[PDB]
Amino acid sequence: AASSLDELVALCKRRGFIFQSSEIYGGLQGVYDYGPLGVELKNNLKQAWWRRNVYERDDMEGLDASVLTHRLVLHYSGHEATFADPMVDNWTPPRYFNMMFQDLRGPRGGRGLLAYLRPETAQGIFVNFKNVLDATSRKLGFGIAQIGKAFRNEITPRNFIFRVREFEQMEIEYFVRPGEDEYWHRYWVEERLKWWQEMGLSRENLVPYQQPPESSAHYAKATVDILYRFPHGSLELEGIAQRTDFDLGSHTKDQEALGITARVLRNEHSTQRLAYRDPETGKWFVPYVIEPSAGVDRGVLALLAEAFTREELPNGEERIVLKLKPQLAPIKVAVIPLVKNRPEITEYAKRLKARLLALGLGRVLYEDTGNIGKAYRRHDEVGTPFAVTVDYDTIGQSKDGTTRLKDTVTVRDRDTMEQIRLHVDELEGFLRERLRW
Amino acid sequence: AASSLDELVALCKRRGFIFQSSEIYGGLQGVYDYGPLGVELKNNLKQAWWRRNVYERDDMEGLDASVLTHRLVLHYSGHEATFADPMVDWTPPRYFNMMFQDLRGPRGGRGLLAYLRPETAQGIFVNFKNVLDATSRKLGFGIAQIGKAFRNEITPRNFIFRVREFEQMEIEYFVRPGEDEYWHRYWVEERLKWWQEMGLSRENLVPYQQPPESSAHYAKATVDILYRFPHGSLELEGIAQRTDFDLGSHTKDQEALGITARVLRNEHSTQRLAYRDPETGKWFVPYVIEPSAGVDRGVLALLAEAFTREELPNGEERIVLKLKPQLAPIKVAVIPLVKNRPEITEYAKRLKARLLALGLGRVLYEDTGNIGKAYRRHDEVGTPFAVTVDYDTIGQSKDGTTRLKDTVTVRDRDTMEQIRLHVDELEGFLRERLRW
Numbered sequence A: 001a002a003s004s005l006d007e008l009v010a011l012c013k014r015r016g017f018i019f020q021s022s023e024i025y026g027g028l029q030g031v032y033d034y035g036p037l038g039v040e041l042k043n044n045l046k047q048a049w050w051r052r053n054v055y056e057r058d059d060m061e062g063l064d065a066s067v068l069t070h071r072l073v074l075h076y077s078g079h080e081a082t083f084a085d086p087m088v089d090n091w092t093p094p095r096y097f098n099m100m101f102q103d104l105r106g107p108r109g110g111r112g113l114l115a116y117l118r119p120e121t122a123q124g125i126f127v128n129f130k131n132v133l134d135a136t137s138r139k140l141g142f143g144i145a146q147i148g149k150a151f152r153n154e155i156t157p158r159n160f161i162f163r164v165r166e167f168e169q170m171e172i173e174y175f176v177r178p179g180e181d182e183y184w185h186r187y188w189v190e191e192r193l194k195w196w197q198e199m200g201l202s203r204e205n206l207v208p209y210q211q212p213p214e215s216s217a218h219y220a221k222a223t224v225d226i227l228y229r230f231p232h233g234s235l236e237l238e239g240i241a242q243r244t245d246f247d248l249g250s251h252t253k254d255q256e257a258l259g260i261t262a263r264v265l266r267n268e269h270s271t272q273r274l275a276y277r278d279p280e281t282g283k284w285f286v287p288y289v290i291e292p293s294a295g296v297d298r299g300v301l302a303l304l305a306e307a308f309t310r311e312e313l314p315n316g317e318e319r320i321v322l323k324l325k326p327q328l329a330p331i332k333v334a335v336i337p338l339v340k341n342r343p344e345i346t347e348y349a350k351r352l353k354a355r356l357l358a359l360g361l362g363r364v365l366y367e368d369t370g371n372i373g374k375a376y377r378r379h380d381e382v383g384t385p386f387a388v389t390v391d392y393d394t395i396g397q398s399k400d401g402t403t404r405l406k407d408t409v410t411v412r413d414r415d416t417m418e419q420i421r422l423h424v425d426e427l428e429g430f431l432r433e434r435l436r437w
Numbered sequence B: 001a002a003s004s005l006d007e008l009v010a011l012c013k014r015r016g017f018i019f020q021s022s023e024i025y026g027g028l029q030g031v032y033d034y035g036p037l038g039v040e041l042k043n044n045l046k047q048a049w050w051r052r053n054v055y056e057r058d059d060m061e062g063l064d065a066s067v068l069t070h071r072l073v074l075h076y077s078g079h080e081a082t083f084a085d086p087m088v089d090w091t092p093p094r095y096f097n098m099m100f101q102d103l104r105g106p107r108g109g110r111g112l113l114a115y116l117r118p119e120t121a122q123g124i125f126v127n128f129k130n131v132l133d134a135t136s137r138k139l140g141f142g143i144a145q146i147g148k149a150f151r152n153e154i155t156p157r158n159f160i161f162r163v164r165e166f167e168q169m170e171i172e173y174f175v176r177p178g179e180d181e182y183w184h185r186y187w188v189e190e191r192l193k194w195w196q197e198m199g200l201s202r203e204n205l206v207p208y209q210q211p212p213e214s215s216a217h218y219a220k221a222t223v224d225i226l227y228r229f230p231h232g233s234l235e236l237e238g239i240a241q242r243t244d245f246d247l248g249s250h251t252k253d254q255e256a257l258g259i260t261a262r263v264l265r266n267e268h269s270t271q272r273l274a275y276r277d278p279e280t281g282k283w284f285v286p287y288v289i290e291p292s293a294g295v296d297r298g299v300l301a302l303l304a305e306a307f308t309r310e311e312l313p314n315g316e317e318r319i320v321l322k323l324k325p326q327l328a329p330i331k332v333a334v335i336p337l338v339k340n341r342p343e344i345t346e347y348a349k350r351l352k353a354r355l356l357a358l359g360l361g362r363v364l365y366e367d368t369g370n371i372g373k374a375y376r377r378h379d380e381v382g383t384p385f386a387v388t389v390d391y392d393t394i395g396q397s398k399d400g401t402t403r404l405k406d407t408v409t410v411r412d413r414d415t416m417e418q419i420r421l422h423v424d425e426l427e428g429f430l431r432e433r434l435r436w
Helices: A007-013 A038-055 A122-126 A129-136 A178-198 A246-251 A296-307 A344-357 A370-383 A424-433 B005-014 B036-055 B070-076 B121-125 B128-137 B178-199 B245-248 B296-306 B341-358 B373-379 B421-436
Strands: A018-020 A032-033 A061-063 A068-070 A083-088 A095-098 A101-104 A114-117 A142-151 A166-176 A206-210 A223-228 A233-242 A288-295 A310-314 A318-322 A333-337 A365-366 A386-390 A408-413 A419-423 B019-020 B033-034 B061-064 B068-070 B100-103 B113-116 B140-149 B165-175 B205-209 B221-229 B232-241 B286-292 B305-310 B318-320 B332-336 B363-365 B383-387 B407-412 B418-422
Touching: A007 A296, A007 A310, A007 A318, A007 A370, A018 B113, A018 B232, A032 A038, A032 B232, A038 A061, A038 A142, A038 A166, A038 A296, A038 B061, A038 B128, A061 B036, A101 A142, A101 B100, A101 B178, A122 A142, A122 A246, A129 B036, A166 A296, A166 B318, A178 A206, A178 A233, A178 A288, A206 B318, A223 A296, A223 B165, A246 A288, A246 B061, A288 A296, A296 A310, A296 B383, A318 A370, A318 A408, A333 A344, A333 A424, A344 A365, A370 A386, A386 A424, A408 A424, A419 A424, A424 B332, B005 B019, B005 B305, B033 B036, B036 B061, B036 B140, B036 B165, B036 B296, B068 B070, B068 B318, B070 B407, B100 B407, B121 B140, B121 B165, B121 B245, B140 B421, B165 B178, B178 B205, B178 B221, B178 B232, B178 B286, B205 B383, B232 B296, B245 B286, B286 B296, B296 B305, B318 B373, B332 B373, B341 B421, B373 B383, B383 B421, B418 B421
Parallel strands: A061 A142, A333 A365, A333 A386, B061 B140, B332 B363, B332 B383
Antiparallel strands: A018 A032, A068 A114, A083 A095, A101 A114, A142 A166, A166 A288, A206 A223, A223 A233, A233 A288, A310 A318, A386 A408, A408 A419, B019 B033, B068 B113, B100 B113, B140 B165, B165 B286, B205 B221, B221 B232, B232 B286, B305 B318, B383 B407, B407 B418
């Protein structure tokens, strides 16, 4: 585990995980960019999440909605009226600053040409309920998963990835029948909690907090936050709320014909009825929604934070090692040529990297950087699990003349630091064993 | 292949590929949303692209920059100026600027203005030094990236084509001033070749080499790959050659580095975006080759191409999306013959999981009524195989034999041929046909 927030910010910048967006012109404070190593880890996390909640389940439909949100969507969801914070200057009278990113479509800044950069992914889901329903012919006890970008017009962007203006989320909207709501809520909480550990976070660092009714927003019958023990303090990773029929409620047509339980605004615009019908009979009703929502960047940081570890070495000095779960490492194997000038060597290495990539266990990388020592260092810092290295013996140029050593390479374990030399054909099975899911 | 643009728009909406963003409130014309089936295909394409240009190569670094762009980036890249033009049509004296913009935090002050990037490339350019430092890369190398971009279109025409929000797959290949012309043709063959591997016919592809009149000033050459869509040729990808303009326009110590393209005096940049050590110690700004594709366009191209209407032996027709298997939103559909039977449904579900485990792509358990409707629904969304489970599969054959236990019928999308095989063979059957 890592001890300081800056150790991370430093590594992140130093090894190419994260960079201050627009750095060369002073930065656009509050927005960051993901480097070579960052994109990989980030994507690996998003994928593992998608595989788990969509592919592996049989009640989940996927989605990808746009960032440009029509003014109305955000009126009827309440944001226009409440997504704000209390602000002032130096002392003027106090007033709420609505934190949404607004931008005007086309020609003129007229009130009717205003649109928003969605501040959360969920509304995209809600407005498409009927749509999704029609096209898939889904029955109840079902949700819609989605990953995407969101923009919060924060006032003061604090410590790193935490208080940012642009970021990404992984949200699910699980539609449920009014009666069964309380069950599904605890079901999802165990599930998400469980997932995070499988990804590599320790139970000791996870904290399932249940919000007291003072904190619960009006339509939220209950909600639990999963916090992670970061170096600088506990920060929220994911939130599993229970929103009754508020969301579907606020956007649907024929509001008073469908017995809506949460208080909604009169909707004089919606063209479709977002409700479900046929509880064996013919009743229309608005489903209740359970909603797990995680923040991609937070997750990426949690993983780094957890993995980060400093080890003392027998000679006296230390080393930084990202102990990331293998399947999630930005790089799985690094193939390194002992000498940089030799062509039969580089050409072999490259031929080998490809053979390994073909196993389909994750990114294999051909490394041509000078100094076999620097390489090992660079890799432990970015958490890659294995390093295979190629030398003259591997080729067949043994100074003694035998070829008993042709096609064998040394593979160095990231964690144990143990190096063993094995023949290539065994190397495959070795890797399957250790890298498969 | 498909004959009309509306046939597609219709299928896309009908089967859950694409929907009009904000439809229930009148739509936010010009922006669309990707449904269950759409997200899948879209992602499948992005991935195949990433695997190819990053994993399979040894000179590529990946990236993911933010949409919120600082005002300055877009000043020095030229964009800001292309639209600082009072056009008086008498209608009022406007600025017909093509970028969405917005202001950061507290006030609408000029120093607090920001933009929603209109292209992904600038994110790459500004980080050149950064990426360089952290990776210790040598020349003959690029940076790949996928992301969102926003064009403040005035009139959103025909579907996916003239839209305000969309995504791109761009690469910035940094090259030494001398070798530029070579790399340019290299990339063109490569991209061209890729597109066909994805399933597009050579007959429908059109490599247009822009004549000196079209080329923006700093562009020493450029080729557009057009696709023959039902409504006409529309641009899929563009491989330009931008010399040292981009890196040039953003770097510090401009006149110390012999920049060849005309750039603006840059009084703000804090880093020097150049390369040094041509064996010696000379500094210079690399030339850039740039393949840039539009995700949505690609998705449409694939759909357009795959779309086909067939006349069947009984007399009726059918719509079949002939998508390349590895790209299909769904690889296998496991379907139960009767919906009420527990031994059947329970069997089928257990089977779908066994198949998903093969790691060949999404397998889906289908519980929709009517075995006929299912087959139809699937050919329409282009899923390659359909396995079906019945009473024989379980072991309740009305003839009394058990020779047919643990076997299922699998219907080929294309040939429509159905063969009944045992489950264990089924695996090998699928690997054969579905692997990359």
